[PDB]
Amino acid sequence: SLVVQEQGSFQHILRLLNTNVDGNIKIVYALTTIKGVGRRYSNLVCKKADVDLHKRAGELTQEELERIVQIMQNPTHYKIPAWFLNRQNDITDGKDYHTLANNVESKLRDDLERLKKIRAHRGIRHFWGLRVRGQHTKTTGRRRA
Amino acid sequence: KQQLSKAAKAAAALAGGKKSKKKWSKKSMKDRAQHAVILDQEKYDRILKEVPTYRYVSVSVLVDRLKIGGSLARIALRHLEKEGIIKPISKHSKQAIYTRAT
Amino acid sequence: TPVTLAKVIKVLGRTGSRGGVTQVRVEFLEDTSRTIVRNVKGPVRENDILVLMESEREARRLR
Amino acid sequence: PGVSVRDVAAQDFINAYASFLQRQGKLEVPGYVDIVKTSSGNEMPPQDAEGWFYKRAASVARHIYMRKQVGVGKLNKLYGGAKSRGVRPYKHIDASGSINRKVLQALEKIGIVEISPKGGRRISENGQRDLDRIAAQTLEE
Amino acid sequence: GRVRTKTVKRASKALIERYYPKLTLDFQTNKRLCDEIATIQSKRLRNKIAGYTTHLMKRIQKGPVRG
Amino acid sequence: AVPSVQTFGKKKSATAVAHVKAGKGLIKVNGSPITLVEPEILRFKVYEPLLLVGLDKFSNIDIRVRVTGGGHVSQVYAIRQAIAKGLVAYHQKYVDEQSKNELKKAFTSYDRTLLIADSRRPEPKKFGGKGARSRFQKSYR
Amino acid sequence: PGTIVLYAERVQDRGLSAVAQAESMKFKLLNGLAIRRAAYGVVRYVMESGAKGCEVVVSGKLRAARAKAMKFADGFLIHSGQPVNDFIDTATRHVLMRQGVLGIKVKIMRDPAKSRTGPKALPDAVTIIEPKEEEPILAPSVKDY
Amino acid sequence: QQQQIIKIRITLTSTKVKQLENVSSNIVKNAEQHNLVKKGPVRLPTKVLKISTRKTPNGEGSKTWETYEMRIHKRYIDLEAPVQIVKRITQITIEPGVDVEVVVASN
Amino acid sequence: FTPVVLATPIPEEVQQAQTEIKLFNKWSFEEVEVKDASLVDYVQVRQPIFVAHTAGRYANKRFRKAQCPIIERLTNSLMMNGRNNGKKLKAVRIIKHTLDIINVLTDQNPIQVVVDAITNTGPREDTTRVGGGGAARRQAVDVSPLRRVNQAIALLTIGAREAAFRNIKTIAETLAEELINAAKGSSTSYAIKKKDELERVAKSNR
RNA sequence: UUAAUUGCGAUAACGAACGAGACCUUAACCUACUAAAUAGUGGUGCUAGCAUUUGCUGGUUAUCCACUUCUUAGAGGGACUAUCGGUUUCAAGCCGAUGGAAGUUUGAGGCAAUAACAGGUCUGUGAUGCCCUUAGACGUUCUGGGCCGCACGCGCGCUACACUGACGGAGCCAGCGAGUCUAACCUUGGCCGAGAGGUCUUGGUAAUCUUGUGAAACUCCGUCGUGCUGGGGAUAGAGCAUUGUAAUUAUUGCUCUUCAACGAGGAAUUCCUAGUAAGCGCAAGUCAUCAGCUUGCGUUGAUUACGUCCCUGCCCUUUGUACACAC
RNA sequence: AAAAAUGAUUAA
Ligand SMILES: [K+]
Ligand SMILES: [K+]
Ligand SMILES: [Mg+2]
Ligand SMILES: [Mg+2]
Ligand SMILES: [Mg+2]
Ligand SMILES: [Mg+2]
Ligand SMILES: [Mg+2]
Ligand SMILES: [Mg+2]
Ligand SMILES: [Mg+2]
């Protein structure tokens, strides 16, 4: 049972990966605000960063926050088994990658534009705005799509 | 029965599509409530001062009477039990019951 | 507060539109010669005690 | 006088023996700890990253003591649980076979269990001795 | 409701007008008599017949019965 | 041999069989002492024979219980019914019956289920609904 | 050749077999015999054979296109309970005619008092043993050999 | 062949309860009239085989269901008899709807 | 008093309960004395129970449930709001905690507090709907003792559940607060204000 | 009076029949008979492993023996509202209590009358009349597509809106099933893999093996902290596998990522009286693969009411009718 | 003593 006494050096809301990560939330669930990182990826990155898991995202010093940024930037170079990522073996270069905050919807645009420019059925269904994963459309999913 | 004309069926379908979502409820929301999960010096002094004379001690009453989150309530409550200024009555997860010492 | 404690001595019958009310005869605890017929919502045995907010009304919906 | 692991609280026995293995430090952690989520039914890793393997090792060793022989699939059906399938109902999903297998394979490495020439994994004499030592200390905690 | 049917009523009435001296006021031996003085396909209907017979015998003891 | 008897206790589908014989006053259930029965929110139900009759006369007798079937609670009820039945059957067979009937008086004075199993039975389900009585939601128009 | 055998044995109480009666009546309808005569004849044969009750139902189209169903019955004929499976025997047969298909349903109550298998009487059929009424002697009149 | 032991086992499987019990009783009887020590007829739990199906041939009307059942009644008897008499018991006392299966156990 | 040695150790705390039954091994039912009349022989505080869990048959008769212990009667009505059907272990645990919170906020027997809350929360007069016309009316009627204690348990549990829904406070604590408020009469409790509203309506339809 | 055209009885009706009942199955009770390494328990009788003034386990029908309490199935017994207290045209009966396993016909079913519907089925039928078609076939097969298509409306449901919770670790518990030799079915166990899975053997034609289906809800101990939040998991992106010749219009499973409505729901409306409602899962049916469905099974287990004819209907009698295609 | 209108043609 640790009851820590600290001065006014608590770090309030902070910026990573062009995304607002706010303090007072545990570091794992604070990082999840960034697009492209979920609870599992946030937990794994936090644990590979050699930091405590009860630091409220406001006790993290700068240096251990650039360590966690670099771990997010290069997931493979920190002993991740590469089946854990978001984009494995892509069309362009076939290298296992993980997209981040501003790049997830960008790569989504690139893939959707590719499927449209190739006129594949999934791409044309996306262009029309229908369901692409094979759901029935007779009754369900009406008020918006 | 009476079949509707194609124009009437189209009008009904277009009306249904244009229809807004009629939420059948009164939606009342309370205001933002914040609790200082980080324990600074002034809040710690308030803890060490007014937690004694509390007839009832628990995570919920620590949250209500002091703007601290449940996590800080639990860890500080166990800290006070370590210091022994509160004695237990029923020990159980998800529900703590504590009163004054001696 | 003048709340009246009365002991039932007879259940007259089951009254009401849906049969949800009981016709009972109750005598008073303080004086057992003050019988009166009342309407009771819930289930009743004999020898049960009721509380009467007003102790002067006769129950309608007879026979 | 005589005491075995049947008269003690199972949960406190598991925790105390897990800490005893934690102090010995010979359980040869698999390496894929800090990654795995211990079951397909789960959706999160264990919240105790540094002791969940030790807790599983103690619980498995106790369970092997309880029964005659228990296999990896039987541990899988045991340690598995319900799985949330979104808009679908729940169903039972077995635990991680690799983790259950590795815990069992660690048990003979720390020497408690043997081949069990009839069946699966069964408790040895030295492992029995170590368990009733931790039983004695846990009873006189 | 435990209203006995006419098969039980008529079997009991004939048994009373046929073996009245042998019949005894308690149920158990009326049961153990009906197996020899009658042939009932089922134990259940035999017990029902014996129970109505012993109830009528209780009635017969304190005065006569019409029919 | 040694003076001994055996009984059983039954909830809905749980059964507990008790071997009751003279000794030094040793109580176990499923090879575990009865004080470890889980849950601890219902450990009182298996304590109740020990607290009603008075364990002073338990010094001579020892009981070993094996319980299977049903759920956890059904096992709790079958265990406590079996221990009560075994105690009063050991009294009937090997003790004077003044003590047998006074035990029966105290047992019936607290619960009838200590000696007589609940006659409530599961009701088989009928087509057209999820349960025996409940029906699927009827639809008009 | 020499181990598989087939033995054919004569049917006794041939009026009691609903299958035989149904086949014979169907052959009567094929031969052109009147429907009322065929049903009353088969009923008479069944009852004279010793069966407790008989039942012949002819459903189809008899005089006009519109359908109907005659019924011919005799004797005692229960409908519910285990004695249906114990004393009732039924047969159903289709009858091709120019106009269509006629269904012939035969139901037979065989007498429980006959046969040596199963119940020899209906359930609840209580029968009493005769008292064999005797005279009471007044005096004791002890006897010796 | 020289009047020795076989450790024979006989299984009776049938739906007809009475047609099963009669043969099993006769085998039991022939044991004592040939002073034969044995294990008595162990009766398996009566297997029931169910089929639940809609009564309607089409798909109209109230969704009424009907269930039909087999009952398989089984008895295994372990016999220890000489060679000249295991045939004496197996060729006789055979009933319709009842079959007999014989295995020379070695366990 | 005077514990005896046993071959299998029995804990000292449970050893003291041999003298008489002790609810949760923490309180005895002696000197409860439901003081407001007309609710006697309907609130069950005479037979002692070790715990609020006993699977007894209390539904096959009209008035059989009145012989079920009042604590278990309160417990069996906390097994709601649909998602909580079953889980009597959970309901019993909540009841144990709420009685502990009573015994720490007030130097009073929690059973005494519960029966006082029921006596103070059972409505004495209600209405019934009569008249098939469009303007249907209500007629005030008296309330039987059994319905009074049933409606009291219902209103206490319902108010505790609603106060527990979507707030930091545990159900055991908000039930204890409701029970403490009702056992004295403070009109800040759901069951008191609901009962007072209902009685006022019967007064207006008298 | 009964659930009953069930009876008491009255009687221009008498004696009869079907239905109801009776009957059969099934859940309960049997220290009573028969027994059982395909169900068991006990003797530790044989060796022992552990702790130590004695308990827990391993090998026990060739490493033995005894007994059916638990288990099963054969024949039975048991309840007949028994006894008692009340009440009655004192009759049929009904209400309480006492025993008993069981006292709403003990519970639940199976079967279930006469008469009818223009009810449904010609797409279950080598059941079928008539009409039509019959070689470029409305026959039968092969390839592909469709049956799933979406501005919309409706009916069954599943998951939810959370702290009586979610997540993590642990405790740890059913009953009904089913399952290969005319060939790959149910799968122990070992090894590899995060997982889904892959590979090598084993057992089971089955109370023997999967399987003690170690299911889930549940309980304890910790993380969260009233924030559409770590509640919810829709939509969508990328990859890894299994079935199948064939997976795109995504069979399904698995991993990571996206993380939408949804704050308890207007009018309205459904089901239910005790092991019932509800919660929770499991098995089976369809199945090569596919459950959010059904048929069963057990698990945890309420509240409220033992009533009335108010609504919606049913039965009997009397009555009115201009209805009989029958308000 | 609240309100309650209607129901196409032919087909024993
Ligand atoms: K259910
Ligand atoms: K085709
Ligand atoms: Mg589990
Ligand atoms: Mg019938
Ligand atoms: Mg379709
Ligand atoms: Mg979220
Ligand atoms: Mg379906
Ligand atoms: Mg009209
Ligand atoms: Mg008209």
A50 is in which domain, residue-wise? 13-78
Residues 6+ apart with CB under 8 A from G57: G69, G70, G71, G72, G103, G104, G105, G106, G107
**Range of D80's domain?**
1-141
* Whole-angstrom distance, CA of residue E47 vs CA of residue E52: 9
Q: Which domains does chain H have, with CATH numbers?
A: 5-95 (3.30.70.600)
- Report the distance separating Cα C8 and Cα C36, nearest Å: 10
Number of alpha carbons in the 13 Å side-chain half-sphere of residue I113: 23
Q: Looking at the CA of A39, name the nearest ligand.
A: 6
Chain A span 94-113 residues with beta carbon within 7 Å of strand J: 98-99, 104, 107-108, 111-112
- Long-range contacts made by residues D21-25, C-beta under 8 angstroms, separation at least 24? D21/D54, D21/D57, D21/D58, D21/D110, D22/D51, D22/D54, D24/D110
D43-CA/J269-C1' distance, Å: 39
At position G41, the amino acid (one-letter code) is: G
Domain ranges, residue G106: 18-114
CA-to-C1' span, E7 to J21 (A):
9
- Alpha-carbon gap, residue I6 to I9, rounded angstroms: 6
Q: Which of D62, D141, D72 is nearest to D104 (CA)?
A: D72
Where on strand K do bases come within 7 A of a protein Cβ? 2
CATH number at E51 reads: 1.10.60.20
Does the domain at C1-63 match CATH 2.40.50.140? Answer given as yes
Residues 6 or more apart in contact with residue I127 via CB below 8 angstroms = I138, I139, I140, I141, I198, I201, I202, I205
As separate numbers, helices (DSSP H) first and strands (DSSP E) second, chain D gives 5, 4
Contact D56, D103 (CB under 8 A): yes
What whole-number distance in Å separates Cα of residue D48 and Cα of residue D33? Answer: 11
How many residues are there in chain D? 141
I169 is in an annotated binding site: yes
**CA–C1' distance G100–J130 (Å)?**
9
Other CB atoms within 10 Å distance of the CB of residue D112: 23
Q: Which residues of H touch F (CB under 8 A)?
A: 62-65
Nearest to G43 by CA among G110, G106, G137: G106
Asked if D30 CB < 7 A from strand J, the reply is no
Q: In 10 A of CB G93, how many CB atoms? A: 17
Instruction: Answer for the pair F11, F77: CB distance below 8 angstroms, yes or no.
Output: yes
Tokens of H42: 């162990």
What SS3 class is residue G30?
Answer: helix
**Distance, first Cα to last Cα, chain A:** 52
End-to-end CA distance of chain E: 24
Give the CATH number for residue A56.
Answer: 1.10.8.50
Q: CB-based contacts of B97: which residues, under 8 Å, 6+ apart?
A: B56, B57, B58, B88, B89, B90, I97, I100, I101, I104
Q: Which nucleotide is nearest to I135 (CA to C1')?
A: K2
I28 near I22, Cβ under 8 Å? yes
Q: For B34, name the nearest residue in chain A, comparing CA atoms only.
A: A24
Rounded-to-integer distance, Cα I63 and Cα D124, Å? 61
Residues lying with their CB under 5 A of ligand 4, a single-atom ion: G 80
Which of B100, B31, B46 has its CA nearest to residue B76? B46
Task: Identify which of D99, D39, D110, D32 has the alpha carbon closest to the alpha carbon of residue D72.
Answer: D99
Task: Check if the beta carbon of residue A109 is closer than 8 Å to that of residue A83.
Answer: no
> Closest nt to I133 (CA→C1')?
K2
The DSSP code sequence of chain A is -------TT---SEEETTEEE-TTS-HHHHHTTSTT--HHHHHHHHHHTT--S-STTTS--SHHHHHHHHHHH-SGGGT--SSSSSB-S-TTT---B---TTTHHHHHHHHHHHHHHTT-HHHHHHHHT---SS---SSSS-S--
Show me where the domains of chain C are located.
Answer: 1-63
Q: What is the token pair recorded at I161?
A: 């559940």
In angstroms, the CA F31 to CA F67 distance is: 10
Q: Per the annotation, does I52 bind a ligand?
A: no
Q: Do I169 and B60 touch (CB under 8 A)?
A: yes
Tell how far the Cα of D26 is from the centroid of ligand 3, in angstroms.
29
H63 chain-F contacts, CB cut-off 8 A:
127-128
Residue D70 contacts residue D82 (beta carbons within 8 Å)? no
Ramachandran sector of residue G13 (left: φ over 0; alpha: ψ -120 to 50; beta: rest)? left
| Cβ–Cβ pairs < 8 A, chains E and G | 34
Are chains E and G in touch, 3+ Cβ pairs below 8 Å?
Answer: yes
Tell me the nearest-neighbour CA distance from D67 into chain F, angstroms. 12
For domain B39-101, which architecture applies?
Orthogonal Bundle (1.10)
Residue F70, classed as helix, strand or coil, is: coil
Residue with CA nearest C1' of nucleotide J292: D88
- Is the Cβ–Cβ distance between D63 and D78 less than 8 Å? yes
- Which of G12, G15, G16, G21 is closest to G105 using CA atoms? G21
d(CA E19, CA G132): 10
Query: F31 in contact with D at a CB cutoff of 8 Å?
Result: yes
Query: What is the number of alpha carbons within 13 Å of residue D42 lying toward its C-beta?
Result: 15
Which residue ranges make up each domain of chain F? 1-127
* Resolution for this PDB entry, in angstroms: 2.5
CB-nearest to I89 from F41, F51, F59 is F41
Domain tally for chain I?
1
Please report which residue ranges of chain B form alpha helices under DSSP H: 6-18, 41-50, 59-65, 70-83
Q: Which CATH class is domain F1-127?
A: alpha beta
Distance CA B60, CA B66 (A): 10
CB G131 within 8 A of CB G124: no
